[PDB]
Amino acid sequence: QASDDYRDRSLSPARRAAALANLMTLDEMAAQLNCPRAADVMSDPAGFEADFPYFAHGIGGVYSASLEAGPEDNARAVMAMQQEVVSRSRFGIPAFVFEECLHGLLADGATQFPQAMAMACAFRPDMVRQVFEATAKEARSRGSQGCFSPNIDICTDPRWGRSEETWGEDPHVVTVSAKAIVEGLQGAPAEYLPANRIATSVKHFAGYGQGIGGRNFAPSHIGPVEMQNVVLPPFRAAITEAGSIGLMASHGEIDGVPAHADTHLLNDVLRDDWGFEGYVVSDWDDVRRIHSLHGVAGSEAEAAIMGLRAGVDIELANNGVYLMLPQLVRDGLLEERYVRRAAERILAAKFKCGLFDMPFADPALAGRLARSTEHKLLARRMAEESIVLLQNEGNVLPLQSSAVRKMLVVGPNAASVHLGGYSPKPFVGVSALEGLQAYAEQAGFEVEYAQGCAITAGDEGNNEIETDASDESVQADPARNRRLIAEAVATAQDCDVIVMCLGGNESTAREAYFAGDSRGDRDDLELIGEQNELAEALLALGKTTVAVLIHGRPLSPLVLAENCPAILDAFYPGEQGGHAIASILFGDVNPSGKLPVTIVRNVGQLPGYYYQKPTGRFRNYVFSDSTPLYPFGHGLSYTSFGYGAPQAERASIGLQDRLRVSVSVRNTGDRAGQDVVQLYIRDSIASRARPIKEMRGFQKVLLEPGEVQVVQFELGPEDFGYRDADGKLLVEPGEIVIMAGPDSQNLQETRITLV
């Protein structure tokens, strides 16, 4: 360690970081803890230094350097900025260049895969890794070596406008997805990142999705055992198994403790229990908000101090409160060892991502990868694996294209592309209307379009031209909608097939920003506005009619589910989604998605997530069907599947043993198809009450007609036990019920005993 040299590429990132940090002044180390927006650094670095003198020593990171630039211009703009940063540091430390990679890179010209919750419907973690390996390549070639993704929050409240960012309600699903995403973006765990990979910052640590009322920023009520067995597991796997380099903290509070000042979470759990060696980044301006919003720090200075000592390493903010850290050290108010501790984490991450050893970006590579043929094909395939068949009464689907003459494609989400939050605007891709038009051209039937109704005012017809940004969204006028509905009814008279494209859009489910009176959470889970009136008016014509749901949050479409026989749930299907919808509507693709959330019947029945305690849904609501509209794991096929009971290899095992379980699944229908075999356990008696069922595995299987297969699962003590308030795994003797089936309701079971 005495001989350690930071210029030695054969040394580990942590040892190069320590050797470099020993050469640095207080001001140089403190500059590494700032991450403003890139825009003002890129446009006038000399003026940025004038306004923010720390920039004489370089910078920790910048956020969103893509700006409005296409792939090659983005790469060149980052190279130019990096040269400005590296020229200011005595040691040539480049900036981290942070972007969003929720479902593809948030940058002009980049491939837009289906939204996270859409992809969660696929139950194909292998394809999730591919999607984010492709995202990483696009990001890194354009100069970004880190991102503020994945969102591995748990969606327990679909009122939340950010639900679409999550992989659903289930800890197992969110955990498996977390690992696939981190390995996709970073590569498999290694001392150094492979080339063409980027650092992840798993967010938001921890409990952000449990905000009361589904209101963004609102406190979460999470007990310590609930924290350990529901909310933390995806983070623990992302950190301790897949090796995520970064982590982002949560806006919110738990029991009065803001996450950005939560030493128990940010230090005791993350550093001591889990051994995290990467960086903790704040969410936007959330260190200041320990004071300005939560009222826990008495000033900006004290907020800076609380966040740093709690364990936040780098502040994502313009003119952040971390700009005060050098003077607070020099004034005696803050121990310099906390500046050094954070800067050493940042530096080791920068070494591990190759910043010191590699070019800044690769403009020509960036141009080849962006929306490449291979990446668009992947986005199409992901959508084909994700779309969920909710119901198909009377086998209306698949449509037979030879028997179609004139199809009406109608609805607020027919002609527009819908990509979800964190997508480059304007949206680029294949709307449902365009997918069906292109399919009709090949198949030889006619397609007619009608608006039907609007969801938000001004969002009608095409989505190709960039809609007025920063303009506040307004609900669509009901009177105009009823005239649009009558127009659609009239146009439908000579159509033999109606395809209604309904749901929500990026204005009715969205992140409610801190500024002003920004809104994005809903107090109702039905289809908003006049869409139900539209669907009823079309369904009354007695035509062959189906619905395709395009939307962000999980929706509870009761009127539609009651009156429309066939419903496809596509969430946001990505830039190739329209082709995938057409292929599924006509049975060229057999739908195979399953719901990664429970769909409750109405918002007054929340919470409805499937892993309730024995008392959680013990009592039902008066005069009201209290069953879910669709249970977790639900999804139909154009074929049928028969299941045998789960078979354990032994009837009894020791507290530390593993156990093999097998399930026989057979295609009992007419068409090749995929089903998702799902494995659940119940810990019958426990030292703390446990859910009535908890998913511990799943497996999507392709089966030809009449084909039968034995699907194998392996469970261990990490599956049969639970973690206590301190994170220690308890395995206790007694009965475990083991359940398997095609969803969380149609289960068969066997029982084993732990001894």
Which residue in the block uniquely carries the two structure tokens 């040892």?
Answer: 15
- Whose Cβ is closer to a second copy: residue 91's or residue 514's? 514
How far apart are CB 687 and Mg ion at their closest, in Å? 8
Q: Considering only residues 37, 76, 215, 271, which one is a binding residue for a second copy as defined by CB under 8 A? A: 215
685 is in an annotated binding site: yes
Contact status: 686 vs a second copy (CB under 8 A): yes
Residue 231 carries which DSSP code? I
CB of 511 vs a second copy, minimal distance in Å = 10
Q: Do the beta carbons of residue 730 and residue 627 sit within 8 Å?
A: no
- Preceding amide of 418 cis, omega within 30: no
As measured in angstroms, the least distance from the Cβ of 229 to a second copy is 9
Position among 734, 745, 746, 750 found at the interface with Mg ion (CB under 5 A):
734
Q: Which is nearer to a second copy, 508 or 667 (CB)?
A: 508
Does 438 bind a second copy (CB under 8 A)? Our answer is no
Length of the chain: 755
Q: Beta 673-683 vs 694-703: how paired, if at all? A: antiparallel
Handedness of CA 582, 583, 587, 589 (dihedral sign): negative
Q: Which of 437, 431, 438, 436 is nearest to 416 (CA)?
A: 431
Say whether residue 293 binds a second copy (CB under 8 A).
yes
The nearest distance, CB 600 to Mg ion, in angstroms, is: 14
Binding-site member from 372, 475, 647, 662 for a second copy (CB under 8 A) = 475
Cβ neighbours, 10 Å, residue 679: 24
Q: Does 730 bind Mg ion (CB under 5 A)?
A: no
Provide CB contacts within 8 A for 51, sequence distance 6+: none
Identify the three-state secondary structure at position 492: helix
Stretch near Mg ion under the rule CB under 5 A, chosen from 144-152, 212-220, 250-258, 474-482: 250-258
x-marked contacts with a second copy along 621-650 as a string, rule CB under 8 A: xxxx-x------------------------
The Cα–Cα gap between 713 and 663 comes to 8
Closer of 524 and 704 to a second copy (Cβ):
524
Question: Which residues, including other chains, have CB under 8 Å from residue 2's CB and lie 6 or more apart?
Answer: none
Q: 491 to 550, contacts with a second copy by CB under 8 A?
A: 507-508, 510, 512, 517-525, 528
Whether 414 and 585 have beta carbons less than 8 Å apart is answered as no
**Which secondary structure element, helix H or strand E, spans residue 499, and what is its range?**
strand 497-503
Dihedral angle computed from the Cα positions of residues 217, 221, 226 and 230, in that order, rounded to the nearest 10 degrees: -30
CA atoms within 13 A on the CB side of 554: 37
Structure tokens at 663: 């399930």
- Footprint (CB under 8 A) of a second copy, residues 330-369: none
Instruction: Based on the shown chain and the rule CB under 8 A, indicate whether residue 684 belongs to the binding site for a second copy.
Output: yes
User: Between residue 720 and residue 739, which ones bind a second copy under the rule CB under 8 A?
Assistant: 725, 734
Contact (CB, 8 A) for 512 and 217 = yes
Residue 593 backbone phi and psi in degrees, to 5: -70, 150
Report if residue 683 touches Mg ion, rule: CB under 5 A.
yes
Residue 297 engages a second copy in binding (rule: CB under 8 A): yes
244 binds a second copy, rule: CB under 8 A:
no
Cβ at position 434, least distance to Mg ion in Å: 23
Residues 490-529 contacting Mg ion, CB under 5 A: 504, 508-509
Cβ nearer to a second copy, comparing 50 with 725: 725
For a second copy, how many residues bind (rule: CB under 8 A)?
76
Placement of tokens 């999470």 in the chain:
222
Least CB distance to Mg ion at residue 510 (A): 9
Nearer to a second copy, 216 or 386 (CB): 216
- Enumerate binding residues for Mg ion (CB under 5 A): 254, 264-265, 504, 508-509, 683, 685-686, 732, 734
Annotated binding site for Mg(2+): 683, 685
